[PDB]
Amino acid sequence: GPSFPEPKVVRSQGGLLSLKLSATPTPLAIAGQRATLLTYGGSFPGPTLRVRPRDTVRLTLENRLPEPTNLHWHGLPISPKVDDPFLEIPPGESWTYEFTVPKELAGTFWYHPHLHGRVAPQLFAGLLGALVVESSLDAIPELREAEEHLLVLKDLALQGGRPAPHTPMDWMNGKEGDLVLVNGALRPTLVAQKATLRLRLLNASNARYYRLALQDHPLYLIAADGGFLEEPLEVSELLLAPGERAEVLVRLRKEGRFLLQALPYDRGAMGMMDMGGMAHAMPQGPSRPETLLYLIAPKNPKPLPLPKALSPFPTLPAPVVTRRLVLTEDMMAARFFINGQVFDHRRVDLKGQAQTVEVWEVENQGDMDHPFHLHVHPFQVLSVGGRPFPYRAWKDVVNLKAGEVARLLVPLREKGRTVFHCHIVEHEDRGMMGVLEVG
Ligand SMILES: [Hg+2]
Ligand SMILES: [Hg+2]
Ligand SMILES: [Hg+2]
Ligand SMILES: [Hg+2]
Incomplete structure (x- = not known):
């Protein structure tokens, strides 16, 4: 094959990407050795999905794992009724994700599981692939x-x-x-x-x-x-x-x-x-x-x-609220917190208004780097550690070193309940996650 291995690409056809993927334990050859991984589409990484703005994506995920799983459309500003971080697909069952790719969008995104407590072992085992918006x-x-x-x-x-x-x-x-x-x-x-x-x-x-x-x-x-x-x-x-x-x-x-x-x-x-x-x-x-x-x-x-x-990056409307979210650690307990609390799916932590802009100040009061991720609502990083960011672009994960504060401009887009969390995924599974409701 080509000297440089890259995942197989699946492209939208006639404005539609319709695909069935199974999440399945898969024997494969990796790094010169045989191993069984958990894969989408029988490969590691999963296939790259390549789409354009306004395309329809219709993705049926079949769960052939021994535990529940789901998909998170990471980085995509779509509805959390579709990119649903609370949805569980039981073993043997299937679920169809259907959405339209937003008009004003470009870049490299990805898909992987997001089920609280189960992300780290599933992602580590191989359940991930890329999505490119041309x-x-x-x-x-x-x-x-x-x-x-x-x-x-x-x-x-x-x-x-x-x-x-x-x-x-x-x-x-x-x-x-x-x-x-x-x-x-x-x-x-x-x-x-x-x-x-x-x-x-x-x-x-x-x-x-x-x-x-x-x-x-x-x-x-x-x-x-x-x-x-x-x-x-x-x-x-x-x-x-x-x-x-x-x-x-x-x-x-x-x-x-x-x-x-x-x-x-x-x-x-x-x-x-x-x-x-x-x-x-x-x-x-x-x-x-x-x-x-x-x-x-x-x-x-x-x-x-x-x-x-x-x-050109949009200049956003003036913000209507400032948030402060402080990250802390209990290392010996392997527990991780936002504003002194661990995740509870029943508890709403922030309530915001669709189509307004918020300033989020995220402060890492731990000793480890913590990369902070917000679903659904891409943000503009204004500064980190008191240093202004040298460019304007949409991000959805921002790294904070120990002691650092990130200041983010967060336009709220789609309505519904979603989450924000650390993207050292073990930290999310161990509690470093909260719930945002947009109305
Ligand atoms: Hg992610
Ligand atoms: Hg997530
Ligand atoms: Hg020591
Ligand atoms: Hg973390």
Whole structure:
């Protein structure tokens, strides 16, 4: 097959993507070994769904797992009556998700389970795939002529031919694995045919961070989680927290082999030690560097010029309310809180008005990085840690380091009950989630 493995794409036809997927234990070959994973569509990752604004999506999910499951349409500003975080599909049963892709939308999104208490083991086992919303912007020559690839960043650990079980420590930290894969492949080679690459990036890991850097090259950020930036932004590196997406242009500068690496990064994971007194928690420190893929540049590369502009970001109406949501931890209990409470599906925590804008101040008072996700309502990050964000774009996950405050501009779109939570998914399963009702 192609040197660079990417999930099979399923495209809308005549404005309709109609597809049946089964969530099923699947024997496959992964990273040179045989394993049974939990998959959608018999593959890991699941198939990439590729749609356009105004398309109809009709997706029937059949649950062939021994426990309930559902789908979360991550990043999609659709109704929570469709993207229903409380819906349970029992084992053996099916459910059809039907929605229209919003008109003003573009980017890389994804799908995976969202059932409180069950997310971490299901996601870790392989239940995830990408969804790409194509844009008329993709037709401008500076993007059209680029070579495009999806990179699904997901790690895994195997034990006895199956995903390794969660340990107590995994529930405290979020589980990371030793197999650090791209599209389910171990350190694949991307033999570029064009001098400009357009890479769509997805962190589908439970807890692992990817501090992305390509040897000898900057990256040009062109999209965040849920849409384009206003113009390309040059960066020397790019951190993708769990749940985040980005799109970058890579402008290959000379012939040769360049490593795309996940550089060392300390997200505040903890170990346990006993040094003659203490049996207490201790910092793991930074992750070890990982090579994600080998990028081979073509002969005499001459990259396209960058787009001078992408998409103008809407200036939003003036906000009508400010929220404050404080994140805390009880590490030894593996419990996690928002404003001093754990999730209760019966309890509404915030009540907001559709079509108004809110300011959300999210404060991490813990010692671990916590990536904060809000369903249904994409937001504009104004600042994090008191530093203004260097671009305007739609996001749905924002990373907060220990002590940091994020200030978000949150337009409320669809009416109904939805959730917000930490995207270190073990933390969500262990309580770090709340309920927003929009009316
Ligand atoms: Hg998610
Ligand atoms: Hg979720
Ligand atoms: Hg110690
Ligand atoms: Hg968290």
